[PDB]
Design an enzyme around this catalytic site. Structure first.
Site, PDB file in Angstrom:
ATOM      1  N   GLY A 129     -10.780  -3.620   0.235  1.00  0.00           N
ATOM      2  CA  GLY A 129     -11.688  -2.594   0.721  1.00  0.00           C
ATOM      3  C   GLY A 129     -11.755  -2.702   2.232  1.00  0.00           C
TER       4      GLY A 129
ATOM      5  N   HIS B 159       0.728  -1.265   0.000  1.00  0.00           N
ATOM      6  CA  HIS B 159       0.000   0.000   0.000  1.00  0.00           C
ATOM      7  C   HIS B 159       0.761   1.323   0.000  1.00  0.00           C
ATOM      8  CE1 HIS B 159      -2.769  -3.142   1.382  1.00  0.00           C
ATOM      9  NE2 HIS B 159      -3.745  -2.405   0.879  1.00  0.00           N
TER      10      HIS B 159
ATOM     11  N   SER C 242      -5.524  -7.575   0.136  1.00  0.00           N
ATOM     12  CA  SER C 242      -5.890  -6.621   1.160  1.00  0.00           C
ATOM     13  C   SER C 242      -7.052  -7.172   1.966  1.00  0.00           C
ATOM     14  CB  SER C 242      -6.253  -5.286   0.511  1.00  0.00           C
ATOM     15  OG  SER C 242      -6.119  -4.240   1.455  1.00  0.00           O
ATOM     16  N   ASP C 243      -8.181  -6.475   1.960  1.00  0.00           N
ATOM     17  CA  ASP C 243      -9.326  -6.976   2.705  1.00  0.00           C
ATOM     18  C   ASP C 243      -9.679  -8.338   2.110  1.00  0.00           C
ATOM     19  OD1 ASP C 243     -11.174  -6.421   4.856  1.00  0.00           O
ATOM     20  OD2 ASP C 243     -12.759  -6.294   3.333  1.00  0.00           O
TER      21      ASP C 243
END
EC number: 3.4.21.-
Lengths: 1023, 190, 95, 95, 95
Positions: free
Chosen positions: A880, A708, A927-928
């Site tokens: 997300g 990120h 990620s999520d």
């Protein structure tokens, strides 16, 4: 003054490269350098054709370089020409729609997600007739394709990753090679990321940092005999390219050549190429920030780090005389303004008198400031920093004084009473360290006595404090009026209209002023007494709703209101939140609308003027007494003037400080930042364009070796984005005509999920497209370019069917059809699953963990959760934050049923999955998405099938943009799993059963991952 | 700070506990004057009430006479149990009461859940639960298992899921909990 | 909420299909609050969504009634999503 | 048509100085039809044309009356040329 | 007295002739700061100009920075010739 040279390619003694976003060519034999193509937008990749005659070029357009297409440059006649009209999406970390390689016959092979439901699905296509036609190779997603001894070499995810040094996740670049005409084997799969593969002789040369730094390596066509040919230690190497004999690459702004034969590395001497004008002019409105009203009907606003005082029309303008990065400006007195000036050391408070012209900056370092206000009498300012402190700063001595410090979040919501005696502010807090919710109570600071009093209890979220003019009552808002609103699709309820205004009389015994208790029936008098004032609180008779600001006036109260709305547009398209200014008459309790279509609102010191930003993006000002006399604030009469090199330096320092200040691990942050500072700061002076700066900043960002670390937004070019015309159809050039090879359609009854041709009553499949708006398309007429020129309008299309059927229709030519392709893909999978499972298994796909994710999950969950089994596909999941909300639904265990006199059984819970569940994931899930993947296994919801995920679980929450609008992200929140620790980061989640999706799998047209999930469940469902 | 959760007298800056009520709208109440009847006759309006405190403290206030105060009595009962649980558990146990399984149930559950679910233990009191249909929604929340934490550069740890109870849970029920209230009690155990 | 237009040539109706979540202001939650949207189906194939205002001279009229696969012909009318309960198609407006 | 404002700080007046010809519609000829324009002279040097709306905080006020070379200070007011016969300066408007 | 025929500075009561131009909008102009470029970046707006006269005279004014001044230069030329002709002819010849 040398330039930053980048991304090269070679052919004989001719070398081409990128400098100043333009393409240059340098002849090693003569030593001459010449620009061969410019003013096309930002070019980032150039590739000679086999015979080195023509050159394939990738260029980006759009202020943020979010669109891209390909061009051909013919060095013979100097002819430039656009080849693709896909307007492929692009980000710095994923610059898709590019040159993949060239095949034996010398035809160009492009990689592009242009016509795919997901950006990670960059398929290979052989270009023909210079764009007229594209033939799919069907080898699945891939970044590069090389041909050795008649067999294909596929490089997956092999693009460079300067923003992530040390990447070892599931998405790392790997290499595959054909072993039997249609049979592929994975030969290069190292712990780290492999980028820029090339073939010299019978060795595959590529780049990786498996040893701790970027270096060139190589292996045989079997992926064996690994060799290390370089030992760089200054800057990572990038962009390998070869002509079959010598290799070329860039490093630290210089072009170099590597001879496989001698293993010798030689720097190419090119010297000073271009130094454009440094002093630039910019449109102030494009970088506008902080608009605020001043006395005398003047206005103040901050743009590109500069601050100005001007009249509404923008004819009389004064630039605040302070160097770069003034963050905020606020009314300080009759002709004075207070401001926050930020440097590499931090932010400082200053004052400027635009009448006299005198300016004074205080030396106190206030840290990183995010909010600033000045008392009406101009004696002190109130400041809030990322230390979570709220403080006053004496505008005369510059002496600060911390009022209180939160340990949860910043104290950016505050107000000062007109008599400068009290300071009310929202105080974030938690009862315990691991609470899931941060509460907020309003605290009040009495300047006299310097003591803090609680205006509200700590059970909810109280905000927007505001004192009445006479400093006798404190008005504020709370999200305390709990009342649930029903979900219209899923059995769910949520708090939508629970905002309610309240008031607290500062003098005990004095009633709620909006109650209109007769004055003759109230025993007045009494002194200020802030003790137990929460016990005196009283609501104001205004219907609950969603309020963001309350302004008490003599006989009315203004309230900023935000209508209940969907989050899709804001979440994905940066759409602003729309509000309306309401007026509540205290006397009659009547509510009226004052102004709508607002997105922001500022109030004058004396409460006489209101400044607002409307959904049209413009700023307006109007007297609170007669909102009808509204004037538009103009700021672009005078140009914004700056120096590229000065801004570039300022931006690098800020990008560098932000990455250090917000990195999740403070300890490590100090070491890293000091180690990379000079190294990259030294390259800044070579930067001439925004893109140049980007290459530097991203490389320094990658030094944190954490996920990120992004670069988004900003202005890189003044070129309008590329356009593409779509009708959700795929075309095939059959003979001299185009034929609709495929017409996409998801759920026919939904909005926007099918070719606009279906609304006319026919399925265009197998139909021939004669012409568009009178222009014949086909063999000698590119249909892509024609659609491109019609995007956004309805054009007459003529179709021919196999028979005597002919159609003349006005068709809507869309600017995009990705969502259509996606919903078509999902619905195709849905049918397949039902078919193969013989109606016993259901299917749900989750595209990301944001608003789109919620939509699609439930969109199918209401129909697919009651089959004997269920397949939850999270492949390509873009992350997300709602994974936890989906898991919650999946976790529901069916334990009962309602048996009606009439009708069928109703399962309990209603949102419970009936049977067995299995989930599918891949390297494009992250990620999520990683969290969901890990969770699915950890909580034993079922088996996880597919390949290892992306491995990026260090979240971000950007709260500062560079002076040019750029939004950089810092990995600030490290996710930690019980039992797994921070181990998911830089690795990902392994599935219970690894099912590769091989190049030969795509060739046969089988999805082995979905086939396995279907079969695995049919087995589980036997008993 | 909530709306409608206290005697309207508190808005005048004093706690009427222990005060003597001399008269209402000029009519003396006491041994020879039924205060309940007087209040009934003023219901829905604001009346002048004269209060006397122990000492020389006297108050003359226009007080809103409510037509009902069940909800205020309820929330007070709830907050009392809450403090008591915190006190007796030495700050280790949280408390939540769910009066029914309708819209009120949802309000009161979340009203305390956002503040009480992160103690070491949690008491979910459903005594007197009047039923409804949201038992399944509340259960779904209590079923969340805390499995992770976000670690910020600044601030405190954020649990994952956000809506997960931190530790041990225990439920109290009685003969007055019923219907959907029965289903919740059975499911909690099951 | 189906509704035919006066001339019996189009069928208008409402759907809770325009999924778009709204955020809970107190708890970490989302819900479908404003997802209602009206749609129209021309009963005669080839005829366009009347609310699109396709110039008559740019449309090949005629055609007999044909209720087959009319769902494939469905088209939304350009009204913001909300929570609608009835749709009344009139000559030049829709209630 | 001279006229002083109420505070006796500016002198407003008219002039047929805005030469611009208008064409005869019958004969080859031109004449000055709309060439009347109003002007203003601040009686105190340094003080600007009041109708220009120069922010007060951006003007160094003060100054005594000084009628010398006042024609050099003359300034026009932003009104379209026409044929004016009188000018009446008011607080926030001009008739 | 005409419109558009003199430096906008004359409206402030002084003849800038022989005055030194310190800065414009806070930006110092001179030896190492091109004034032509500074003016160019202000064209069409009013900018604060600081002037220094020979003595103790210093001015701070909001001056209108025009986009063009040809007509002014022209009218100045014509009037100069006019005065010269009157002077050299001893008031016997017009221009």
């Amino acid at each position: 003054m040398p330039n930053l040279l980048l991304n090269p390619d070679i052919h004989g003694d001719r070398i081409i490269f990128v400098c100043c976003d333009d393409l240059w060519e340098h002849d090693l034999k003569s030593g001459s350098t010449r620009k061969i193509v410019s003013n096309l937008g930002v070019i980032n990749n150039a590739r000679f054709f086999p015979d080195g005659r023509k050159i394939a070029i990738r260029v980006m357009r759009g202020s943020s370089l979010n669109t891209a297409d390909l061009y051909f440059y013919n060095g013979e006649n100097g002819e430039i020409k656009r080849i693709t009209y896909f307007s492929g999406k692009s980000t710095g970390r994923r610059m898709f729609t590019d040159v993949a390689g060239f095949d034996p016959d010398g035809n160009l092979i492009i990689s592009t997600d242009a016509m795919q439901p997901f950006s990670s699905m960059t398929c290979l296509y052989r270009v023909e007739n210079d764009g007229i036609n594209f033939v799919p190779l069907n080898l699945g997603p891939a970044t590069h394709i090389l041909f050795a001894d008649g067999r294909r070499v596929i490089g997956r995810n092999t693009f460079e990753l300067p923003h992530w040094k040390g990447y070892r996740g599931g998405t790392r670049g790997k290499i595959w090679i054909e072993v039997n005409s249609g049979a592929f084997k994975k030969i290069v799969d190292m712990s780290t990321h492999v980028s820029s593969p090339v073939i010299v002789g019978h060795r595959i040369y590529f780049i990786t940092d498996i040893d701790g730094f970027g270096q060139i390596y190589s292996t045989d066509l079997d992926g064996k005999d690994l060799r290390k040919h370089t030992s760089f230690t200054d800057y990572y190497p990038r962009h390998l390219n070869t002509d079959g004999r010598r290799i070329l690459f860039s490093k630290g702004g210089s072009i170099y050549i590597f001879n496989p034969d001698t293993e010798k590395i030689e720097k190419i001497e090119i010297g000073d190429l271009e130094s454009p004008e440094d002093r630039i002019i910019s449109i102030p409105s494009k970088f506008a920030e902080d608009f605020s009203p001043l006395d005398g009907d003047l206005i103040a606003f901050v743009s590109r780090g500069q601050a100005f005082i001007q009249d509404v029309s923008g004819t009389y303008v004064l630039k605040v005389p302070e160097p770069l990065r003034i963050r905020y400006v606020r009314r300080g007195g009759d002709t004075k303004v207070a401001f926050i000036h930020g440097t590499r050391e931090g932010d400082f408070l200053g004052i400027y008198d635009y009448r006299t012209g005198k300016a004074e900056k205080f030396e106190e370092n206030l840290g990183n400031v995010f909010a600033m206000g000045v008392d009406r009498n101009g004696k002190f300012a109130v400041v809030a920093n990322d230390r979570f402190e709220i403080m006053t700063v004496d505008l005369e001595t510059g002496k600060p004084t911390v009022i209180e410090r939160s340990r949860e979040a910043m104290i950016t919501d505050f107000t000062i009473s007109d008599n400068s005696r009290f300071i009310a502010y929202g105080f974030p807090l938690k009862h315990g360290e691991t609470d899931g919710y941060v509460m907020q109570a309003i605290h009040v600071y009495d300047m006299e006595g310097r003591k803090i009093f609680a205006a509200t209890t700590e059970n909810s979220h109280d905000y927007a404090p505001a004192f009445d003019a006479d400093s006798k009552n404190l008005y504020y808002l709370s999200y305390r009026s709990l009342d649930p609103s029903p979900d219209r699709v899923v059995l769910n309820f949520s708090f939508e209209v629970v905002s309610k205004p309240f008031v607290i009389p500062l003098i005990p015994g004095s009633p709620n002023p909006t109650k209109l208790v007769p004055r003759s029936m109230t025993s007045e008098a009494g002194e200020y007494d802030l003790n137990d004032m929460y016990k005196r609180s009283s609501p104001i008779n205004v219907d609950p709703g969603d309020y963001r600001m309350i302004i008490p006036l003599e006989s009315s109260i203004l309230i900023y209101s935000v209508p209940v709305h969907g989050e899709f547009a804001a979440y994905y398209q940066g759409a602003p939140e729309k509000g309306v200014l309401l007026k509540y008459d205290v006397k009659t309790r009547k509510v009226t609308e004052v102004k709508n279509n607002l997105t922001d609102l500022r109030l004058s010191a004396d409460r006489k003027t209101v400044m607002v930003r409307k959904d049209d993006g413009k700023i307006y000002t109007f007297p609170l007494e007669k909102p009808e006399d509204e004037r538009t604030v103009e700021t672009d009469k005078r140009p914004l003037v700056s120096s590229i090199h000065e801004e570039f330096l300022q931006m690098y320092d800020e990008a560098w400080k932000l990455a250090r200040d917000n990195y999740w691990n403070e300890a490590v942050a100090k070491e890293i930042s000091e180690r990379i500072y000079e190294k990259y700061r030294n390259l800044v002076p070579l930067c001439k364009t925004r893109y140049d700066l980007s290459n530097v900043i991203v490389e320094m960002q990658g030094e944190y070796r954490t996920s990120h670390s992004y670069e988004m937004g900003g202005t890189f070019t003044d070129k309008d984005p590329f356009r593409s015309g779509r009708i959700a159809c795929d075309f095939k050039l059959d003979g001299d005509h185009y034929v609709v090879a495929k017409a996409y359609a998801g759920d026919y009854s939904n909005e926007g999920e099918k070719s606009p041709i279906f609304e006319y009553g026919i399925d265009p499949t197998g139909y021939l497209i004669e012409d568009i708006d009178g222009e014949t398309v086909g063999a000698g007429s590119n249909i892509y370019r024609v659609l491109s020129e019609k995007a956004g309008t309805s054009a007459r299309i003529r179709l021919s069917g196999k028979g005597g059927d002919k159609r003349d229709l006005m068709i809507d030519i869309l600017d995009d059809d990705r969502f259509i392709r996606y919903r078509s893909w999902v619905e195709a999978n849905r049918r397949y699953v039902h078919e193969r499972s013989k109606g016993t298994i259901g299917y749900i796909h989750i595209p990301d963990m944001g608003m789109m994710g919620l939509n699609e999950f439930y969109r199918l969950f209401i129909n697919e959760s009651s089959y004997q089994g269920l397949i939850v596909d999270v492949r390509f999941n873009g992350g997300g934050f709602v994974s936890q909300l989906i898991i919650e639904k999946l976790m529901n265990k069916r334990i009962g049923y309602d048996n009606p006199r009439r009708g069928t059984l109703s399962p309990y819970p209603t949102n419970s999955v009936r049977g067995k569940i299995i989930a599918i994931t891949n390297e494009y899930a992250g990620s999520d998405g990683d969290i969901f993947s890990f969770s699915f296994k950890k909580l034993g919801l079922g088996k996880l099938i597919g390949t290892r995920t992306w491995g990026g679980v260090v979240g971000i929450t950007p709260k500062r943009r560079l002076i040019d609008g750029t939004v950089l992200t810092q990995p600030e929140f490290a996710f930690w799993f019980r039992d797994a620790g921070f181990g998911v980061e830089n690795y990902g989640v392994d599935p219970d059963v690894e099912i590769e999706y091989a190049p030969h799998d795509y060739l046969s047209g089988k999805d082995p991952q979905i086939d396995y999930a279907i079969d695995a469940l049919i087995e589980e469902l036997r008993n």
